[PDB]
Amino acid sequence: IERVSGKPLLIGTDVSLARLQKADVVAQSRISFPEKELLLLIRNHLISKGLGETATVLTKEADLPMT
Amino acid sequence: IERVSGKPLLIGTDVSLARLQKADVVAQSRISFPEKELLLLIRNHLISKGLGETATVLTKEADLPMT
């Protein structure tokens, strides 16, 4: 099944063949993302876990849309 | 197949039945994690993405094992 399809490196998963060339595209895609969506996730984690005395410090490095 | 097994809420995935009670355990498990492994992942991301002038600021909130 590996030979007549897109050659996975002997990983045993999703042995159907229509589900094997789905795994050709989803794996080799080029995912990129903006950094701004992640920096708000950092600040939303610090305030919730007790140590929120650097949320005001993060005004300097980048923007602060929410308080 | 839903009725003789652990009743997923009509989500069409992994239609084999041995692969259906694997999904009973992996989903309903109680995953917990220490916060310390995540706070080093925050600091290792800030230094790499150009804005590393709060890595020394993170000495105050928690420990700084690596520079």
Secondary structure element (H or E) that encloses residue A23, with its range? helix A22-27
Residues 11-40 of A with CB under 8 A from B: 35, 38
B57 contacts in A (CB within 8 Å)?
A: 54, 57
Neighbours of A46 (CB within 10 A): 19
The amino acid at B48: S
A20, A6 Cβ separation under 8 angstroms: yes
Instruction: Confirm if A6 and A24 have CB atoms less than 8 A apart.
Output: yes
Q: What is the largest CA-CA distance in chain B?
A: 58
Q: Which residues contact A39 (CB under 8 A, 6 or more apart)?
A: A58, A62
CB contact under 8 A, B49 and A62: no
Solved with: cryo-EM
Query: What are the CA-CA distances from residue B58 to residues A15, B5, B15, B34, B39 (Å)?
Result: 47, 49, 48, 18, 9
Partner-chain contact B62 A53, CB within 8 Å: no
% helix, strand, coil for chain A, step of 5: 35, 0, 65
d(Cα A33, Cα A56) in Å, to the nearest integer?
A: 25
